[PDB]
């Protein structure tokens, strides 16, 4: 199979990925960096066709271990301005209400948090300052995006 | 095309229908088996507070909708509590 | 009927102030999430459930051959046909 494609450049790219998952394990560093920077040089020039497709597979289990999404949601705003810039829709009207699940499901960590600690710092307060903040340009990119009644429905009940 | 109105001291007002249904209580009180057939019976106002109950309708219907700046509604301090325990039933 | 609204004129003050401050919005009405109704429209849904549900088999049935002789010839009074569908 692998004398097949040997002098193909995509099969060995996606492939490195399955054969590492497979001994990686479940919980482990598997989707940091290789899942991450392999979107990233893909939408530079793909016309983001399926870099939310490798970018939302790594998010949708990564919820397993919580870490800070912080970065991690800065950047799905960002690409998703520039395809409306573009004049491209690519968006399916259901893609961003598993992002909008995600922001309500992060948000209510930070104010417990706040309730933990006693003083903690400030940086503390502005890791629930700035998560508003990103909320907003989700919610007004989804205003400027055209999608169905059913779609607005899921909207409204997140 | 008129309406009566008599108070708990006995003074009885007499103004326009048009002018009196400005406010909900009135006319709840005349719709219904009380169709009056009129006179309106109020059993816990006193005077001085419905002189100037009658005396706003006229002010609120002249100059609504008007460019010339409207004038200053004057309230004596003393009866100032009663004409908002007054409003309060009457939803003016 | 008629009842209902000569009633309703009574109880302006409970509606007004004390009932629609505690009751649900419209929004929470809707697309779920999130019980205490204004009188006048409460004895509306004391007639639905105590006095046609448990009679909505013979209404349906001599309605449905007065029609049918209708068609086949006969005078009915439209009037009191008329208010008992219209009822619902």
């Given at each position: 199979e692998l004398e097949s494609i040997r002098?193909?450049?995509?099969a060995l790219h996606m492939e490195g990925l399955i054969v590492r998952e497979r001994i990686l394990g479940?919980?482990?560093?598997?989707?940091?960096h290789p899942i991450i920077y392999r979107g990233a040089v893909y939408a530079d020039n793909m016309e983001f066709e399926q870099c939310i497709k490798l970018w939302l597979h790594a998010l949708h289990l990564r919820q397993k271990g919580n870490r800070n999404t912080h970065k991690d949601l800065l950047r799905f705003a960002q690409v998703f301005s520039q395809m409306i810039h573009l004049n491209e829709t690519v968006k399916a009207p259901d893609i961003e209400c598993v992002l909008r699940c995600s922001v309500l499901e992060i948000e209510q960590s930070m104010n417990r948090v706040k309730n933990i600690s006693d003083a903690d710092v400030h940086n503390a307060m502005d890791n629930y300052e700035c998560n508003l903040y990103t909320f907003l340009y989700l919610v007004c990119i989804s205003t400027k995006t055209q999608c169905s009644e059913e779609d607005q429905c899921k909207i409204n009940k997140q | 095309m008129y309406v009566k109105l008599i108070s708990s001291d006995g003074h009885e007002f007499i103004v326009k229908r048009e002018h009196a249904l400005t406010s909900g209580t009135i006319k709840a009180m005349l719709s219904?088996?009380?169709?009056?057939?009129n006179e309106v019976n109020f059993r816990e106002i006193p005077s001085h507070v419905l002189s100037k109950v009658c005396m706003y309708f006229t002010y609120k219907v002249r100059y609504?909708?008007?460019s010339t700046e409207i004038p200053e509604f004057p309230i004596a301090p003393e009866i100032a509590l009663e004409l908002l325990m007054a409003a309060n039933f009457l939803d003016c | 009927s008629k009842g209902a609204d000569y009633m309703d004129c009574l109880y302006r003050y409970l509606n007004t102030?004390?009932?629609?401050?505690?009751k649900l919005t419209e929004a929470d009405l809707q697309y779920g999430y999130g019980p205490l109704m204004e009188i006048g429209e409460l004895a509306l849904d004391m007639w639905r459930k105590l006095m046609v549900e448990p009679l909505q088999a013979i209404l349906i049935r001599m309605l449905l051959r007065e029609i049918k002789n209708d068609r086949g010839g006969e005078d009915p009074n439209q009037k009191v046909i008329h208010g008992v569908i219209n009822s619902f």
């Open positions: 002098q193909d450049r995509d479940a919980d482990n560093i598997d989707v940091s | 219904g088996p009380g169709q009056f057939a609504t909708n008007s | 102030q004390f009932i629609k401050k505690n």
